[PDB]
Amino acid sequence: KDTIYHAKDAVQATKPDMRKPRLVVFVVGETARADHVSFNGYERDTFPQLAKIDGVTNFSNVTSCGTSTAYSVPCMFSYLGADEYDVDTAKYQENVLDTLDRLGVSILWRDNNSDSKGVMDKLPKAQFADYKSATNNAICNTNPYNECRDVGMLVGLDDFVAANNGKDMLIMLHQMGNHGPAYFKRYDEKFAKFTPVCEGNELAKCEHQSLINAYDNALLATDDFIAQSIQWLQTHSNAYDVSMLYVSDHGESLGENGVYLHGMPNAFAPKEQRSVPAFFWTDKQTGITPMATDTVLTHDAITPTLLKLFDVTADKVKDRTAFIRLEHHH
Ligand SMILES: OC[C@H]1O[C@@H](O)[C@H](O)[C@@H](O)[C@@H]1O
Numbered sequence: 001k002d003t004i005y006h007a008k009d010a011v012q013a014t015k016p017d018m019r020k021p022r023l024v025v026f027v028v029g030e031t032a033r034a035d036h037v038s039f040n041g042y043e044r045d046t047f048p049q050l051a052k053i054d055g056v057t058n059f060s061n062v063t064s065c066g067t068s069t070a071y072s073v074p075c076m077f078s079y080l081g082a083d084e085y086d087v088d089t090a091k092y093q094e095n096v097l098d099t100l101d102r103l104g105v106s107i108l109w110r111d112n113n114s115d116s117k118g119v120m121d122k123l124p125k126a127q128f129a130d131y132k133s134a135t136n137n138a139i140c141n142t143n144p145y146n147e148c149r150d151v152g153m154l155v156g157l158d159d160f161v162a163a164n165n166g167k168d169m170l171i172m173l174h175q176m177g178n179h180g181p182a183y184f185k186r187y188d189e190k191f192a193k194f195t196p197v198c199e200g201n202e203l204a205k206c207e208h209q210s211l212i213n214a215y216d217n218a219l220l221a222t223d224d225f226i227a228q229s230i231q232w233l234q235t236h237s238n239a240y241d242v243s244m245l246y247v248s249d250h251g252e253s254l255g256e257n258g259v260y261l262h263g264m265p266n267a268f269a270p271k272e273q274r275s276v277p278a279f280f281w282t283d284k285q286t287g288i289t290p291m292a293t294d295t296v297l298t299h300d301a302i303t304p305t306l307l308k309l310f311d312v313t314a315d316k317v318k319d320r321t322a323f324i325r326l327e328h329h330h
Pocket residue numbers: 065066067068069071263264265266267
């Protein structure tokens with residue numbers, strides 16, 4: 001079907017031959033709950049490595065648009081926003097990646113989760129890569145499950161930067177993250193910090209604390225993946241203005257009222273399935289400034305954030321709140 005347009009007015013105010021090119025990693029998270037983030041008040045240190053990195057902003061009031069991967073991911077990149085979003089027609093709308101690609105930003109999507117749920121479908125096929133494959137992902141033999149790890153998506157990104165030398169670049173890394181029910185499979189042994197761990201597939205039959213322990217160990221591995229993603233960006237900070245955005249697609253029920261996993265219709269889904277973490281990191285020289293940590297935010301903030309990071313204006317989101325501010329200190 002023909003593409004329905006939303007941002008044909010979009011203009012990029014500055015080009016990478018007149019200022020530093022910009023390089024952004026957007027980590028599309030999976031199944032992570034805001035209330036299990038240390039920064040949000042959780043009594044366990046689930047993000048020790050991010051805690052040591054300067055310039056990380058944690059956002060304490062972020063609500064997902066939905067409770068599943070197929071529903072939330074397209075909306076996260078949409079112009080319609082959660083209130084007018086239609087999952088069944090999202091694929092035919094111009095989305096924020098379409099706009100950025102059209103204006104010259106090089107887009108890459110690596111996926112260790114499933115796929116882009118239609119978001120990459122209008123862009124050239126080679127700009128999407130399946131990193132659940134052990135012949136794309138070199139980090140699948142570190143665990144007895146032979147499960148490919150999110151950090152494997154960082155291997156060879158330097159090839160992409162070199163192939164796009166001096167251009168603006170936006171790289172999506174779609175995480176396996178905290179996907180259940182087998183939380184215990186989601187992390188290598190070095191992250192088996194909270195013990196004992198539920199290693200059964202029937203969650204209600206595990207002792208509750210052992211389920212929480214497995215879930216929190218999986219968060220430690222995501223803390224590590226985000227920290228290494230920032231470290232990778234930092235190797236490019238002299239030539240590029242580098243930033244990292246993380247937002248989870250939805251949360252997770254962990255036995256409250258006997259509910260497990262996610263995917264429940266928004267009308268009656270419990271809050272645990274909607275309250276998600278978000279982090280923003282940027283290098284000091286970029287001039288990008290985060291919004292207040294307690295700003296009331298939703299997935300609708302993602303599209304204007306991605307546009308602002310590349311100096312793009314679009315009428316459709318002119319009134320939207322982003323994760324980053326409009327004002328600039330000189
Ligand atoms: O029930 C169908 C859909 O309803 C939405 O409100 C939820 O966010 C989705 O996860 C679900 O798939």
